[model samples]
Target: MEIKVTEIRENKLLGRKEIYFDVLHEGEPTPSREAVKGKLVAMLDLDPNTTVIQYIRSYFGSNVSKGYAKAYETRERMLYIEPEYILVRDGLVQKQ
Candidate 1:
């Protein structure tokens, strides 16, 4: 698994520009491109006007081609994907 920073932007409110990345698989296609793109779209909560940049490779393998376009998002903004945690108060278990 390898990732490359294809583009970046500046954000004032979040103190960072929202980031979008192109995920590359070396030899095997573990998660399909569409699936990964869907995950990214969901994670970023992006609108239709979001901008995305990436280096595309067409002749990867099979019928796969790069430069596939989805809803693009601006680059290099800080976004947090929160982890699942159980809140415990005074040793009492609480699920958040």
Candidate 2:
């Protein structure tokens, strides 16, 4: 798997960093958000709990996938902007 970051910017209003990137993988199935999130965490040196995979779009018959993510400085900041249910569903936050 390979990652190419296309854009990264600090979103002050959202209290997070908005990331846009491309993933390259030659395989049958497309990469899932969980897989992308894990790779992004390592590549970006971010805490998994503070990262959220917003979306992933795969090009037809191509090995490239475009993705968007958000990296929050803290869990609280993430929760402030995103709905609690969505964060939990995306595995960015634990259910309690």
RMSD of each: 12.4, 1.3
lDDT of each: 0.40, 0.86
User: Could you tell me the lDDT of residue 25 within candidate 1?
Assistant: 62
- Against the hidden true structure, what lDDT does model 1 obtain? 0.40
- Model 2 residue 8 CA deviation (Å) reads 0.3
Tell me the TM-score of model 1.
Answer: 0.30
Cand. 2 Cα-lDDT: 0.86
lDDT: which candidate is best?
A: 2
Task: Supply candidate 1's per-residue lDDT for 15.
Answer: 46
What is candidate 1's lDDT per residue for 1-96, written digit by digit as tens? 344444545555544344546566656644354454445556556542232323245454633334323232232231221112311221122365
lDDT of 2 by residue, 1-96 (tens): 888889999999878999999998789358766777888889989888888888888988999999999999898998889998889889667798
What TM value does model 2 have? 0.90
